[model samples]
Target chain A: VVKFMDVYQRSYCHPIETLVDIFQEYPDEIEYIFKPSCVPLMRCGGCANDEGLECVPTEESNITMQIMRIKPHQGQHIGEMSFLQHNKCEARP
Target chain B: MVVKFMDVYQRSYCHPIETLVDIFQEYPDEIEYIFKPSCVPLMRCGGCANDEGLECVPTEESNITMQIMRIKPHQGQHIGEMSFLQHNKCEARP
Candidate 1:
């Protein structure tokens, strides 16, 4: 099972500066990592209530990417990120 | 199951809103999918291209991002959140 505290940390410190934060303190029973970025992008994370947490505004010209994964059991999961671009400034999720 | 859509009036361009909610009479115990709002700045535009398109040209633009924080199966708990901003203007109305 995924650790409850790991989820709480992500929920509490949302949009972290680096994807590494996602793997930080992740239970040894479960593990995940983000593929390297193909393009330049800014990073942000941490809870809304966190003191001194930083955030960068989403650019109108830039597209956003989200990675979702589900692990029914250890050593197996379903993960995907949408890469289809829409027009000059959007992505179809 | 409930699909909670943000109000239409709260949209960058105001228009009549419609949404459909359909779930199995016996909903699946486990299901997951990407979640994104349909009416972002790029998806919405003035009607010059087509008669049926949105007539109001947005004087400004807004951008948003969402991240799924967690999904817990045992407690039937799912949590996600988003942050957004309206740029080039303080506020707008249809």
Candidate 2:
């Protein structure tokens, strides 16, 4: 029952697609628990490959999102999905 | 810390390969934790698909093994590898 968190950011090029692709590649056999929030939102969870589910996505949102992958143990895995089009070049401009 | 365990069994035709293939096909972009035991050995861990390491295998053994995938929270994944040749049918038996 341990968890470790990792954060990642992808360029403005198809962030959602990239996340989904990653999920598809490493499908999770367990159900994903999602947390929704605004203002620098961050979601976290563990990887359940043994249950047949291997990936989990965060709740969809419009604001800038932070995705965190957490491993509950020394040899565990986690996956995450975030919203797209936040804090982009256009927005910054 | 939160963890959920799940057990799975595959036909004797190809157990280890099947398990490995599943891990490769569903490559976790994270790290995996492993547990060791003797009788009905069960290994459990989470999938840390973010770090360079995504999959984790248990210590090799000759006896029958039991593998369990545990999800600490919602939207998590786990991968496991077990030794083969335990409860398998002969070529002609299957």
Candidate 3:
């Protein structure tokens, strides 16, 4: 399971070294590891293609509501709904 | 540190348990969380849905810059959480 954590740290944009350390402390908690990326079972499809060029441009925001929407599962969470935007090519940068 | 969401946000990536416990270590009354995503598909080209009559193929232009990011949390009260995932692999499907 720690291996998953290691790969996860390398793969995603989140700094989870602390979390990984905790997981290492109690390796028993990790019941199962789905993919080396450490993506949970429920996230099987959600985390894939994460390495691709994001179709939508990134923006700096601080609004409470907007921040809440940034959660991975939230509608506005990054490229989750980028397919609908249909502007991946133009949005680069 | 800032949590930069370079790609789609995968809520289940890090289990909520660890995240929650991690935050409590330095609990705050209330903190702000911020993040962003960048387009960097692994396949880089062609995994788009293939319509019955349309077959997708890889393109050189799409692979110009292909790579993933290390999303790190910037400023705010961030908590660590964990997810109990079953054995399986992630994939992009229609």
Candidate number achieving the greatest lDDT relative to the actual structure: 1
Interface Cα RMSD per model, in Å? 19.1, 18.7, 17.7
TM-score, one value per model: 0.17, 0.15, 0.17
Error of 1 at B70 (Å): 7.2
lDDT string for model 2 (A52-91, tens) is 4323333343432233234444333332343332222211
lDDT string for model 3 (B1-94, tens) is: 2223432124323222211122212224323422121111132112222233443232222112212222346644322332222212233433
Q: Where's the lowest-lDDT run of ten residues in candidate 2 chain A?
A: A4-13
Displacement of residue A89 (Cα, Å) in model 1 is 33
TM-score of chain B of each: 0.22, 0.17, 0.17
lDDT of 3 by residue, A1-93 (tens): 223344333333321211112133225534422111122111101122334632232332221111112323434332211111111122221
- Candidate 3 local lDDT, residue B49: 25
Top candidate on DockQ is 3
Q: Which stretches in model 2 have alpha-carbon errors above 4 Å?
A: A1-44, A65-93, B1-94
Backbone clashes for every candidate come to: 7, 42, 42
| lDDT of model 1, residue A29 | 23
